[PDB]
Amino acid sequence: NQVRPKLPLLKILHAAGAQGEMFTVKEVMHYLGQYIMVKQLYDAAAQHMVYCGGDLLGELLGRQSFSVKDPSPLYDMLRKNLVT
């Protein structure tokens, strides 16, 4: 089954190379991960920390950094930005 990202998350996925408007959740997670990797946002020495600053992802989350080990805020953003 596919989900439809809402516009602010869709821009992020497109920035990471996603094409189109409909994706499986695994595909959403792949492209959102790709955004973080290709923009080198994770800390190379503490790779669960993501420093997004004021980029699209930091604006969407309302935070300049987050930890993949504490994913509640990510899951909140994903809930609000994926139409199942």
Next chain:
Amino acid sequence: TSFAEYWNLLSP
């Protein structure tokens, strides 16, 4: 542990 390995553990 790499970013990719941490990221793969997410399960929204």
